[PDB]
Subunit: 193 residues, 2 copies
């Protein structure tokens, strides 16, 4: 859990919000993703079937309707969100090593910049998820007309309801994280002056 709190962005300049609340939500998202990765999204493509005899229609329809899986999007989002925290940690380690082998304002500015970057990454991933999948709910039946499928074919999705439930959980957690990051930057600015 210590590695998770390090990846959250806990810093000596962090207030209570960033130290005790943001890290817990980060760990919660990690745990939910670990639970839901291969249990419910494991057979997304192998169980995807269409009512046709045309060879190759299943694969092209699956690629058309799922350009990138939800789990992979959430994994990329978590990696990119955790990157600035470990960047700051490595910078702190470098500064301490330089001190050992031989100011606070630089640390403060680095912390606020990293928080802003985390907010930006969360916002852009929310926007791209909205672009790819406008509705939070997943449907049982889809209509596919991509070549080589003739006319329009019916295709069926695996576990729509469970995927909808986990999507709701993940989106709520991401929204809470965005709100907490905005509160963090506002609180730091207020404390500055």
């Amino acid at each position: 859990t210590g590695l998770y709190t390090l990846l959250s962005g806990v810093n000596r300049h962090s207030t209570a919000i960033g130290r005790v609340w943001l890290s817990v939500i980060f760990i919660f998202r990690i745990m939910v993703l670990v639970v839901a990765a291969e249990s419910v999204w494991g057979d997304e493509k192998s169980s995807f079937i269409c009512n046709t005899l045309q060879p190759g229609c299943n694969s092209v329809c699956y690629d058309q309707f799922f350009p990138i899986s939800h789990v992979r999007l959430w994994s990329l989002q978590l990696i990119l969100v955790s990157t600035p925290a470990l960047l700051v940690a490595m910078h702190v380690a470098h500064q301490q090593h330089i001190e050992k082998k031989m100011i606070s304002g630089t640390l403060w500015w680095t912390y606020v910049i990293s928080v802003v970057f985390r907010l930006l990454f969360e916002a852009v991933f929310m926007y791209v998820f909205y672009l790819l999948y406008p509705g939070y709910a997943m449907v049982r039946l889809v209509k596919c007309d991509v070549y080589p499928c003739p006319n329009t074919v019916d295709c069926f999705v695996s576990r729509p309801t469970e995927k909808t439930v986990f999507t709701v959980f993940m989106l709520a957690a991401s929204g809470i994280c965005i709100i907490l990051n905005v509160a963090e930057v506002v609180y730091l600015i207020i404390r500055a002056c």
Copy 2:
């Protein structure tokens, strides 16, 4: 061949047109139908296939696109066209038997009425063929959306080109028969006065 000439409508009041030309066309139609009945229309339904996994779609699509086979239509047309000729023949046999056990105008009127009825039957069968199958040509691929087929499916017809050739032959023969019957009634009316 004598039975065929009897079924054509050969009568003692018949002129050359009805005695030597109409009967030959009748026999020609019979022979072409016998050749084409089971050779080319035999596998019309068993070889009819559609690109789908839906059970029962082949049968409903075949029934939708072929309400009655061409061969059965031609068989019914031949039977109904040959009916008045044998009706007249049985009436003549009855008259001769009555004469044996004990006028010409009755025979003349019966002959002209039978020719008119043959013309009407040929015309109505031509019209119903035009209603069911507007084009003389048969296509390779058809689009079917009848329940329970989902959306629209592609279905493939057996031997479209050979069926088109035989359809052209049969339609030309029927048209020639219609023209000859009209000429027969006109010639009989002219000879009457």
